[PDB]
Amino acid sequence: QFPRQCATVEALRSGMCCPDLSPVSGPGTDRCGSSSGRGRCEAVTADSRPHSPQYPHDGRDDREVWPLRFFNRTCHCNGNFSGHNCGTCRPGWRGAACDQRVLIVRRNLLDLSKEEKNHFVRALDMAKRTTHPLFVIATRRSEEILGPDGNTPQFENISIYNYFVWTHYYSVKKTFLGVGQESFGEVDFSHEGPAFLTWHRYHLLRLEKDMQEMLQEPSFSLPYWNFATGKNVCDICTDDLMGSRSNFDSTLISPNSVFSQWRVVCDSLEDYDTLGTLCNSTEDGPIRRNPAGNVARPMVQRLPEPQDVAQCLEVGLFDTPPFYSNSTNSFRNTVEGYSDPTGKYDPAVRSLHNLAHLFLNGTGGQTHLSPNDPIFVLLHTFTDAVFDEWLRRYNADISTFPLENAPIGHNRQYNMVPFWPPVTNTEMFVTAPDNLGYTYEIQWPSR
Ligand SMILES: *[C@@H]1O[C@H](CO[C@@H]2O[C@@H](C)[C@@H](O)[C@@H](O)[C@@H]2O)[C@@H](O[C@@H]2O[C@H](CO)[C@@H](O[C@@H]3O[C@H](CO[C@H]4O[C@H](CO)[C@@H](O)[C@H](O)[C@@H]4O)[C@@H](O)[C@H](O[C@H]4O[C@H](CO)[C@@H](O)[C@H](O)[C@@H]4O)[C@@H]3O)[C@H](O)[C@H]2NC(C)=O)[C@H](O)[C@H]1NC(C)=O
Ligand SMILES: *[C@@H]1O[C@H](CO)[C@@H](O[C@@H]2O[C@H](CO)[C@@H](O)[C@H](O)[C@H]2NC(C)=O)[C@H](O)[C@H]1NC(C)=O
Ligand SMILES: *[C@@H]1O[C@H](CO)[C@@H](O[C@@H]2O[C@H](CO)[C@@H](O)[C@H](O)[C@H]2NC(C)=O)[C@H](O)[C@H]1NC(C)=O
Ligand SMILES: *[C@@H]1O[C@H](CO)[C@@H](O)[C@H](O)[C@H]1NC(C)=O
Ligand SMILES: N[C@@H](Cc1ccc(O)cc1O)C(=O)O
Ligand SMILES: [Zn+2]
Ligand SMILES: [Zn+2]
Ligand SMILES: [Zn+2]
Ligand SMILES: [Zn+2]
């Protein structure tokens, strides 16, 4: 989750993650591109405000007041610069001066030409096989991060797409208990609470940026899946897109799709929750997908209706107390899918984003594994298009987004876990076209 440069004994010892940009005069002489004016090494801001109660709750979780368990100094960039060392630009800008506005367009995957479709799944496949040039992932919790001999950082290289999967797993994993310790309350830094929409927003942005980097195609954009069709099939589960059903195992992907070759990460909950370890970069086992195949829950075998999207955009409040999966008249809880499309919570309703996950009846539905099915990307670009439309209709009314007593990870000014450099929910609560340099090509149901 941290730059390779910072995953060292010395940098953890200093508490400082301020890598060089262009260290012409030797190591440490252009931290954060300070010698060119691009940024400065400064103290991290981290939300201190209180969260909703948990029984029991030790507070030993390395995700509290993120990222302070590891670093308390990052790069703060000036102007429209950003990046872990301020070597790149804020979203929406390009150039060595970061002064050319760029605007990329995210579109319906089904609207793409045959050429762009092939480019997408090949780009996706590439990002699955290519080492992240920048981030490395911890395989051990903080108290063991430096190894048995105390001089060996427990960090692994990981692929671009697997990093996208890893960050999601880390945000939902259970707090370790140990030996003799009671069952700690279950927590979720990226679902069941207001930060769900902004966490996943940044999640996508980080993948888009990493893939534009990988391809050296600055305008590359992530497309989206309109799952609000009422359909009883998955209309992008074809061999020229996300993969059709295997004729040999009806829960596998057709061997004629590259995605049948993908192998998953983070599928060892039993190992982690007992050995005390974290998901690592070693893959094991294929994607399972079985659209409409959940015969035990008939509600989970059709997709959301088109009016479900239009109706949830009528919920005027962004979120409501207790800012949880049981909130009512809360647009966040509606689009996430724990309340019905009108606003009304019911513990039996599964709608929209949650409905779309369960529909897949496979790897795409398990909360710790779901990004391993690449349909995750396009399910979430769609969800984010709904978020972006809401932000527009209601001029980004951030007021009902709680500053405190939200579930842990979800306070308005929390640094979304485990993204780097630190980045608050507030920074994602903006219309995308003007403030984040992307927009959606989408028409909304007009009822
Ligand atoms: C920002 O981070 C700085 C770096 O700290 C690391 O990174 C952060 C993000 C965390 O991961 C942190 O745990 C990492 O260590 C941080 O500076 C560091 O602050 C710590 C905590 O105070 C310092 O450790 C303490 O040092 C004192 C005094 O130094 C003694 O040096 C020798 C060595 O033994 C002694 O013989 C002398 O008596 C010196 O006086 C120790 O008294 C103290 O030990 C006691 O406390 C610890 C827990 O803190 C217990 O385990 C012990 O048993 C003792 O009860 C600490 O070890 C550390 O030196 C310091 N490092 C540097 C490089 O400055 C900084 O404070 C953070 N800034 C902010 C604003 O929060
Ligand atoms: C996919 O759906 C199937 C069938 O709808 C699920 O397996 C059933 O789960 C129920 C409830 O837990 C069990 O009592 C049944 O024994 C299971 N049926 C069969 C035929 O195995 C399955 O868990 C779903 N998988 C995912 C990943 O969503
Ligand atoms: C939503 O779920 C929360 C969290 O479980 C519920 O809060 C509980 O409320 C009861 C009585 O009000 C307390 O005894 C529990 O300790 C609370 N749990 C926690 C974790 O704090 C709440 O009841 C639900 N809210 C609604 C509106 O139904
Ligand atoms: C990580 O990758 C970089 C280049 O991508 C390489 O220089 C380095 O040796 C790799 N690190 C490890 C720990 O294998
Ligand atoms: N109700 C489901 C919906 C869901 C949400 C997110 C996810 O990654 C996978 C999912 O399957 C759950 O909380 O497990
Ligand atoms: Zn706490
Ligand atoms: Zn600054
Ligand atoms: Zn998620
Ligand atoms: Zn999701």
Swiss-Prot record:
The disorder on record is: Albinism, oculocutaneous, 3: An autosomal recessive disorder in which the biosynthesis of melanin pigment is reduced in skin, hair, and eyes. Tyrosinase activity is normal and patients have only moderate reduction of pigment. The eyes present red reflex on transillumination of the iris, dilution of color of iris, nystagmus and strabismus. Darker-skinned individuals have bright copper-red coloration of the skin and hair.
Gene Ontology cellular-component terms for this entry are:
clathrin-coated endocytic vesicle membrane; cytoplasm; endosome membrane; intracellular vesicle; melanosome; melanosome membrane
**Location of this fragment in the whole protein:** 25 to 471 of 537
User: What name does UniProt use for this protein?
Assistant: 5,6-dihydroxyindole-2-carboxylic acid oxidase
Q: Which gene encodes it?
A: TYRP1
Binding residue positions for Zn(2+) B:
H353, H357, H380
Q: What is its EC number?
A: 1.14.18.-
Q: Which domain of life is it from?
A: Eukaryota
Associated pathway = Pigment biosynthesis; melanin biosynthesis
